[PDB]
């Protein structure tokens, strides 16, 4: 051949159990709002309603993680600690 | 505070501007002396946050060892609020370079096809980098293909616990042309069409 | 007997325990990748050379291709899984189920007579020296 | 094709660090004597010197493992206390 | 063929990360001064800075290395303490 | 190398080793310290040479 490719640098991206089809909290979906949410428009002003990130790659509403910090914040999907890395899918 | 982000990248990245140590000390003072009397930091971290990915994912050998005064200036000019998750990043290197051993020892193991050589491989967080972006998807050229190929395969047998993606708007490659073999460079943009021009010459764009 | 030898015992038997964990890692490992599709349905076990007396595993035999390619895939995963593991291939062991085929009636060879079925299969009327 | 295989029940074996090439506690071999018999006739009768495995699947000479089992015996090669669970490669 | 080579015993040298390009410590090149050199004359005799090679065949200018060896002494390009092997490329 | 042990690069030299050469009424085995193979090599491909060529 005339171009052969000798070395490759990729970067491999990964998320622990993000669930995309499922909140593990809400268990409704990654997107389209949460349990407490329900209807999109409500009164609710471009749906404050976002996704959450921490640094244990989990993702859920904010408005689902939300309610676990008042209680015990240990990431239920995992022994982490939630943190606040993200916000937005 | 993004012309102030720029001006430390280039003070970080370029070695020639302030060679001696003790003259790049006393700049880097007066650069955080003059961030103490700016306001919005916000928009300074995130700056500072995308210089230190696209440093940190080019070619590296940068310094390896301005990054500890760094990371020292900003505890004590930030605190402990956006540190914390820099020096996370940090650790996210040292993983992708450890995966990258990870993926170097696996090759050893098996590397069944020959795409899989000296795969420079990384591996990081989504959380700590900005690479929210994942998702070019686009073909890829037959060796290095396979070689994702492998690597994903060994990664999971490993920690099973991790949806790999792939994308294409980060790294790098080296492409060993052939009178002498001058080897190229390929930001893994331009490695598709190259790829599709090995296949068959002559196209277009709407090839 | 005491606790001479029934200690050895448990640990052969926490070896089996380890073989059928391996069995499923192996099997969630196909089931995520596994290029090989000689895997279709994989029952592999891992043993120690101490507690077995498996020191004979040196049997230097050809593997059928489907099999072939399955303990390709198996030697790849699992040395992913724990680098640090000398995997060594051997046949005096274990078992397979064969399917034949008016009804599609399934065999099975305990591992001694899968290379010259093979053989079979790629070419009849064969013979000891073939 | 006639013949078809579709379960397969193998067995796997495997050792942690024997060092077929190189008794980890003498550097000689895994066979061929240790540093202490040199001379594979000798007086030996039948060469008393074989081969020791422990439950953590390490292989030394009998006589290397032997010389260690009067001070601190924790099989150097890893954390496991060493065992004799097999006589002879 | 009259002549057929059968054996060959070559032997083969490497080195780790030495970046001919680039001094790892300074970043300007392996050779032609560093940092705190600049000038190749000025007053030197004979430009004393020389290129340092550890056990961990990592090379840098000597005075590169030397500004190190006050503080920790790793060799930053991996985990192994550095050493002076080799003075001279 | 580049596909196992991908931390360093090779250089190539013919200042050390040696060679064993099979030559060939008995096959004898010469033996060459890596400095006598390049000329070897070539008069195998055409002798006849000199020292221009
Ligand atoms: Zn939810
Ligand atoms: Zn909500
Ligand atoms: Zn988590
Ligand atoms: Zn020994
Ligand atoms: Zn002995
Ligand atoms: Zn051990
Ligand atoms: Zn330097
Ligand atoms: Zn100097
Ligand atoms: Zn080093």
Redesign the interface.
Known sequence: ??????????????????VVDNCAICRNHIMDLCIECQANQASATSEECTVA???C?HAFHFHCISRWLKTRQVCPLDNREW?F??Y?? | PEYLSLFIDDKLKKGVKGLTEQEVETILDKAMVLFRFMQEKDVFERYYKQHLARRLLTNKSVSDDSEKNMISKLKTECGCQFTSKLEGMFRDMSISNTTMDEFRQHLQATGVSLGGVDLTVRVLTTGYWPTQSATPKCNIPPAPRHAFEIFRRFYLAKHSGRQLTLQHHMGSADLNATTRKHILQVSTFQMTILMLFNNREKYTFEE
Chains 1, 4, 5 share one sequence.
Request: cysteine-free; overall charge positive; hydrophobic content about 50%.
């Open positions: 051949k005339r171009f052969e490719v000798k070395k490759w640098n990729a970067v491999a991206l990964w998320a622990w159990d993000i990130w921490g640094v790659n943190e890395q993200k937005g899918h």
